[PDB]
Design a protein around this nucleic acid. Structure first.
Lengths: 60, 60
DNA sequence: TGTATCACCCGCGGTGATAG
DNA sequence: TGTATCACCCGCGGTGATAG
C-alpha cells in the first residue's frame, strides 16, 4: 500500500530518482532491472520506500 | 500448503534429507540456517519441494 | 529419521570433505 | 520528472564514471 514493482516504479519515476530512493547507484537499478530480479517496493505515507526481493532457493 | 520454514523443516527432517531435497549440499543448509536467511519451503502433494527466499533490496 | 566445522572459487553462497 | 554501457572488487551485485 502501495505495493509496486521495481521496474514499474522505475518506469514511473526514472531510474535515477528510484535509485536515489533506495540509496544505491542508478547503474544498480538498471542492472537489476535488466537482470530480471523480482523486486518490490513498498511506499509509505511519507513516501519512504522499502524494497524486498524474492528469490528461489538455492541461489545457484 | 504446507508452507513451512527452512529451519523448521530442517528441525523436523534433519539437515541432510532436507539438503538432499533441495539438491544441494548439507553444509549449505547449515550455513544457510545459521546464516539467518529467510527461506521457505513449499510442499506439494507428492512431496516435492520448492523454496524461495526473501531478501531486502539492495543486497548490500 | 545426527550436525558442525573447513578451505576453495565463482564477499556472499555455494562445494566437497572431513569428523563425530 | 532521460538510460545504458564500462571496468573494478568484495560470480552475483553492487560502485563510480563516462556519455547521451
Amino acid at each position: 500500500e502501495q505495493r509496486i514493482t521495481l521496474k514499474d516504479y522505475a518506469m514511473r519515476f526514472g531510474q535515477t530518482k528510484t535509485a536515489k530512493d533506495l540509496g544505491v547507484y542508478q547503474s544498480a537499478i538498471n542492472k537489476a532491472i535488466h537482470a530480471g530480479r523480482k523486486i518490490f517496493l513498498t511506499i509509505n505515507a511519507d513516501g519512504s520506500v522499502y524494497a524486498e526481493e524474492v528469490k528461489p532457493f538455492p541461489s545457484n
